[PDB]
Amino acid sequence: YLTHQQKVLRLYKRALRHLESWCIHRDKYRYFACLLRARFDEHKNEKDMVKATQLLREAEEEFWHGQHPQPYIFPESPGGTSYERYECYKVPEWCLDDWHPSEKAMYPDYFAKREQWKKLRRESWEREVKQLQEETPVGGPRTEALPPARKQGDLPPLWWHIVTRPRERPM
Amino acid sequence: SGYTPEEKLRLQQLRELRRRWLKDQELSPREPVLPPQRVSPVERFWNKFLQDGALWKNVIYKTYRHSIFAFTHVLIPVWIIHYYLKYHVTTKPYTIVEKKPRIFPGDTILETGEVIPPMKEFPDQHH
């Protein structure tokens, strides 16, 4: 679900991107950037839930008629010509545990410091289980948001893979 | 609309941990611990002979490296290729077929010395 305000806010962002693609030039884009803002600003005060929504549907339907057929996409955004480009260099952390002992010997410090996290993970795991199962309603969670740690020495529940994700340019 | 009180904390805690994990990824000055390896004398020859700039004696390395490549990659294969063609391919019938050269009026034949008659007298006109 999305609130009515969010949908208008979303439409405001989308229209400017498509508008920018048509205009290209900054000054020409800058001129019309305020003109579109004017159309949004005036209808801010409309306090009728029925009339106000009806304005949005026309706003959405005018945008779809005037959208750029080839909108500019940022290179790494879904659809841009860099999306998922480096996903082939992202190897999960657990692949290290399979390294040959002679291969680990080339990085004595890194693997020595790795055991601190693995030791930290095992120590903190059971506490993370207890924290979640007391804040969890009887029927289970109703939303996907998670609580943070609520003591000293405790780590947020379900933190390992969020912390230990591969870098954006791992190679 | 913004973050709730706890969300600003979980991100702060996760971000604090995340940066700590990212710091560990750095390597020590010694790492990687390269195992000992035996190097040929020539590698020690060029490493020390090339410490100085000395443009004049550096170009020798360019010539040397090209000299080595020009021998083991161009000269030797043509010895094998030419040897292969001369005494094994050319000895069999029609393996290599040449298009006979074009003979023009007014030329002498190396094999025989025959002289081809020149063409007739053109009605020359410079236009």
Binding site: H100, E103 | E26
Partner: peptide, 12 residues
Amino acid sequence: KRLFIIKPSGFY
């Protein structure tokens, strides 16, 4: 600045 690059085992 040198960063460790995680890769699958290459020894095998």
